[PDB]
């Protein structure tokens, strides 16, 4: 008969220490690289190599913004003159900013706020 049948104890039925315990567990299967595919796999797991198929906007999300924040920036013009020549200048400014693909929403908003300030001192 197998060793798996027989008498048993019958006793029971059904921080830093953890970190280093897991790091020591990692060493159990820590072998040297066995070929080139394994090297590429290890590098991409480490974040070394590019992801394929290549995504030209990988790792970039523009702060999760949506298009209507980039195209419709006229809600930042509420505190300005609504019908004078600053309305003209600032509406055209925000039209310019809405066509800028290189800036995020935050920089555009800060720029609009700077004009807010500058006109208010003046």
């Amino acid at each position: 008969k197998n060793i798996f049948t027989g008498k048993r104890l019958n006793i029971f039925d059904m921080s830093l220490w953890d970190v280093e315990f897991a790091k020591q567990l990692a060493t159990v299967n820590e072998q040297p690289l066995q070929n080139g595919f394994e090297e590429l796999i290890q590098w991409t797991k480490e974040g070394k190599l590019w992801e394929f198929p290549i995504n030209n906007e990988a790792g970039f999300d523009d702060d999760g913004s949506e298009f209507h924040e980039h195209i419709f920036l006229e809600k930042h013009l509420e505190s300005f003159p609504k019908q004078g020549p600053i309305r003209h200048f600032m509406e055209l400014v925000t039209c310019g900013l809405s066509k800028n693909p290189y800036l995020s929403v935050k920089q555009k908003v800060e720029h609009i706020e700077w004009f807010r300030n500058y006109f208010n001192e003046k």
């Binding site: 197998n2 060793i3 798996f4 027989g6 008498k7 048993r8 104890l9 019958n10 006793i11 029971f12 039925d13 059904m14 921080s15 220490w17 020591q24 567990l25 990692a26 060493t27 159990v28 299967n29």
Partner: protein, 164 residues
């Protein structure tokens, strides 16, 4: 608990045990790793025979069930590693440890079989251990798992049996 674990980690078994008794006197409860530390300390304690050391380990297990702490893989593996130090007298207790480890539902690791094989090698269990392990895929569960195959092959060398 942390003092106990570090205390054993640096081989200070006697006052490790004394501080455990102090812990009990303060009506406090110990953690599984602390119990494993304490088992290792009990076995490495000097001037005691096999039987009283085994009784002390059993007493520790009765405490384990007393404070509602459930044993895990590391506890049984430590028990078997300690039992390795007592050669022939420890064989049936090691087998009983393995059977209880299965009955509780804790899957044996590679380190378990490493300890068992090295304990009995001082030998036909390897047939059974292997007939269990054939076809199975394993994961790192014990630091000593990497020592299995080596020890396993040693048996094959000692037994001069090629099919193993």
């Amino acid at each position: 608990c942390t003092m106990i674990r570090g205390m054993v980690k640096h081989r200070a078994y006697e006052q490790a045990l004394n501080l455990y008794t102090e812990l009990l006197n303060n009506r406090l409860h110990a953690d599984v790793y602390t119990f494993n530390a304490l088992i290792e300390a009990t076995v490495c304690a000097i001037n005691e025979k096999f039987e009283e050391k085994w009784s002390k380990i059993l007493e520790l297990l009765r405490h384990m069930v007393a404070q509602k702490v459930k044993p895990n893989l590391q506890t049984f593996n430590t028990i078997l590693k300690c039992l390795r130090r007592f050669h022939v007298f420890a064989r049936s207790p090691a087998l009983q440890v393995l059977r209880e480890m299965k009955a509780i539902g804790i899957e044996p690791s590679l380190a378990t079989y490493h300890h068992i094989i090295r304990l009995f090698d001082q030998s036909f269990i390897i047939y059974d251990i292997m007939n269990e392990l054939m076809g199975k895929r394993f994961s790192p569960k014990d630091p000593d798992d990497d020592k299995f195959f080596q020890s396993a092959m040693s048996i094959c060398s000692s037994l001069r049996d090629l099919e193993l």
